[PDB]
Subunit: 273 residues, 5 copies
């Protein structure tokens, strides 16, 4: 059937269909995703007063990230369960286009508003030395937007046009490397003039940032990471992609936010942990 510029989940769903395990696991992991975001929202609000006033905007931005992450990852989960329906004759879940096609775009538009806030919020905890606040912020915001927008365009072609898919992905990757570059500077300058305890947390934040953010391009490419007609161009690749996206989102948003909160505590002139 004609699916056009649709995600590979739909092609698997329309041809092989999904086993009970593939369909249920994807539903469960996407549901856990939005559930963790609302739990995180509660954590960030309830811990605001654990740090000095000057650091509380970081807790607030974490909470702001959680609210939209809950809503968009809730929509993403419903998109999954609505798009694939059980066939009694074969006992597998097949594309049910009456529920609309499945698209990972809900997650991407969450990134569009989260990336700017996540990159911004560290600047409310650490102090820059040589770099200008305005300059770092503007670079984060510009490259952040371009990275997500170019990737959003690319993922529509992940089956229909592999060339467009890889070119847009490559452009996205360029902006990604720029952000890694700027964030590395921010971490280094942030370490200057703070306790060894604070410096250790910033080191952990850099590792978390590096691993969690790198998962995303991996999830982007997932279906083709085992080449043409590979193991991952299957329900196994669908499960893998949705697991990785969910791990990345929890790591880049919630764990990132917790570590920043712990940093703010060590830098706080009143409180301690």
């Amino acid at each position: 059937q004609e699916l056009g510029n649709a995600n590979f989940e739909n092609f698997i769903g329309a041809t092989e269909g999904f086993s009970e395990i593939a369909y249920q696991f994807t539903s469960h992991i996407l549901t856990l995703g939005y559930a963790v975001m609302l739990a995180g929202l509660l954590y960030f609000i309830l811990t605001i007063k654990n740090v000095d006033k000057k650091f509380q905007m970081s807790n607030i931005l974490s909470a702001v990230v959680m609210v939209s992450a809950f809503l968009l990852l809730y929509a993403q989960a419903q998109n999954w369960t609505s798009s694939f329906t059980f066939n009694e004759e074969v006992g597998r879940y097949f594309l049910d286009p009456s529920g609309d096609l499945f698209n990972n775009g809900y997650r991407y538009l969450n990134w569009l508003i989260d990336v700017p806030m996540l990159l911004f919020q560290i600047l409310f905890v650490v102090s820059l030395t040589t770099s200008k606040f305005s300059s770092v912020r503007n670079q984060f915001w510009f490259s952040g937007a371009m990275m997500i927008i170019t990737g959003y365009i690319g993922q529509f072609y992940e089956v229909s046009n592999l060339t467009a898919f890889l070119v847009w992905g490559a452009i996205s990757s360029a902006f990604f490397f720029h952000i890694l570059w700027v964030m590395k500077k921010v971490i280094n300058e942030g370490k200057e003039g703070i306790s060894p305890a604070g410096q250790k947390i910033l080191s952990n934040i850099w590792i978390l940032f590096l691993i969690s953010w790198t998962l995303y391009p991996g999830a982007y490419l997932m279906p083709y990471l085992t080449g043409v007609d590979g193991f991952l161009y299957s329900e196994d690749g669908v499960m893998a992609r949705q697991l990785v996206y969910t791990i990345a989102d929890v790591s880049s948003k919630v764990i990132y936010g917790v570590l920043l909160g712990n940093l703010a505590i060590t830098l706080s002139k009143n409180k301690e942990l």
Copy 2:
């Protein structure tokens, strides 16, 4: 088929239908729209005590704007996904009237209650000099209501009666120019007697206000901005309209509210 006084989204949906990209993008952008409003709601509540008591009503009004914006833009998003259904034979999304026709009216009624609050809330941060509070408020509220009501009537005719569409739009535009006039005065008087930092933020507020508010009439006209049978009388114009409305709403409500909060901080005798 007979659609009557219906938005052009329905005519595109009933003839050409929407590609995966056009349908999914519109769904995504409308969903982002209501998600940003609920995120904004949290931001405005959590930052209330960042400014002196006298400024806190501005945070409160921002929050009030967010609550209804979330609800109305949520309804608007559901209206989209319910009104267009995938056709397996051609692989495009076509008008599914069992979900009702699509209408941008949910967004308009949000404007009706938001415009008065957005125009009002700046008067809790800045001090007027030459203008009377009651006079400015009454002009904002009267012209604000008339602008939205006349526009709301017009958009029903955007396909069925181009003349009614453009006349109501023109009347709406008149009230719009009046509001721009009054708000310009409010900004100028607000700058008088405050720190240069506060004056700079008010300058940014004026630019944001001018650009964000002008996007609306653009979105109103979107389908016809490339003339008869133009590039925008298509799924591309639908995508463009819903993107512009979403950008305008985020800018005029959330970013506006953040800048007013930042102004209140600079004017606050405790914070800096």
Copy 3:
């Protein structure tokens, strides 16, 4: 088609159907209705500490009114969109009984719990002089309940039995006049011993109360206000009724609550 004791919206929907404008406008105005109630909820909670402790129960009761008004007016909005479905052949929205018949009863049961709270809450801002708190409260609550219950019964017959409709409406009106009487006394006693600023706000509250509460019996009668087969026995009367109910509910609940809050501020020593 047998509709029995059903609101006239269903009869219009089953015969003429609704134009795009009539259906969409009604959907939009009913949606705005519940949206304003949730916005009001936030306003009343966030402004609690703007008045002295003794006045804060009024903010609390406003908030209590908003919560149930949001839920009931949300249900009322869904009742509308579920009950009328687009017919592609004629391009109008017709009664779709699979969604149940439309009934204004959700709004009425909101009134049942709101009327007592709205009448009660002014007694936490103003001080009575010659009248006893308990006596005024008991009169408000008894007449308030009877007014809503008798009206609720009446509106089921607004098409099926014009006599029952008008008799129950008349009984309801009697209790309404009693409430107007008691509220007038409350306003007068409330004005005694407070600043001219406070007295002005109470005057505005009385005008708001009088206009907003009178809109309701108007919305009750709406379909027949232009007589048999008049202009209002149509989709135009449906639009008019739902607009008036929404204006009345916003005015009697939210604007009323804001004015009471502003009164509390002027009467506040802080």
Copy 4:
């Protein structure tokens, strides 16, 4: 039609069906029910700081009761509208089993967690004299659980097996009388050593408790209170049962909680 161990609402719905008034009223009253619970939730949270710290646990338990009452009574309302669908040919609402059968069990499981908290919370406001806190609590919790569980079992048989229905109901009634006994002692001991104002509120709490709690067994028996093929074995009995359950739940949870809060205020040193 084979309905098995199903509530009588289904048998009425499957045979006579429900008139517009019977269906709409039941929908409205069940909706009001959950709407009042969420409004109550707001009231109990916003008034926590109106009493001394030692009494605030009572406000908290009221709020805890409201949250689950909202959710369960919301589910109960949706169960009603989903189970009965309009038939255009006769103009009545008939059992639509695609929506599942209607069962009052959502309300019962709410009782299971509410009864223990409602009986418990008064022990945070009044001081016992003869009785031990732990002992009264344990009696309330044990008899409360058995009362609801035995009743929950019984109501499944209210049509399929009148004997099982009446026996389980009788066992439930025994636990009910035990609770009335213990609560009476608690009220009496609570009156000892407090202001006459506090004693009057406790008297009102006892009357509210006695009337509101006795409504439940009445609603249990409702369909048969006019005997075989009586007036109440009808849509009129369905309306009556759902009205009584809603009045009882509002009274036993919200009004009870308000009176306890008012008692806590009179006993408060601040």
Copy 5:
């Protein structure tokens, strides 16, 4: 019918179907489950300031557990009502695969994020003596994750492959015994140098932990606890499993959280 690697609920539903009591009870108990979690959420937020700052993280983690437990157990309840539909001809609820198959996986993924937080939060109330905080935490988190993941895999095979089901379950059990071991040490070290009041609560916490956590493997095996074609390989086993899971979740999360809060109060210098 071809169901593949599906839970036994689906096989009962596809063959015998469910009686009114079995279907309604399961719906009610699953609904109570998520309702208790949201009520618990309110309790934990409202009691945060009842303990010294250093203990408040325990209240916060209880609340965090409640939020996701509400959402996941809500999804689990909807999965039940969507998967089984009334058949009018036989009067039983049969598998309706248009609603997707029923899977207990929503509950398992709640465990995945809850187990780490529940094991973690006690370390914010008690003080270790001989054991290192980081070491206990890392063991809890590693074994906690492996226990849930291995169990999650196993339950997909509970009908399709009894060997895989029992082997994965056995591996899960190994990690379970490790956690019981570490938690026992934590309780013992926690008792050292604290008031008798604190020691009593920790004893109660250990009993609650031991009983509530052991319910889970019981619910895992439920269908086969009476052997092949036993009493429990039926709607009675489905009811039993969902009851036990709901009791376990309430006990391990809410009651556990309340006891930890009570411990924090006794250890609080205010």
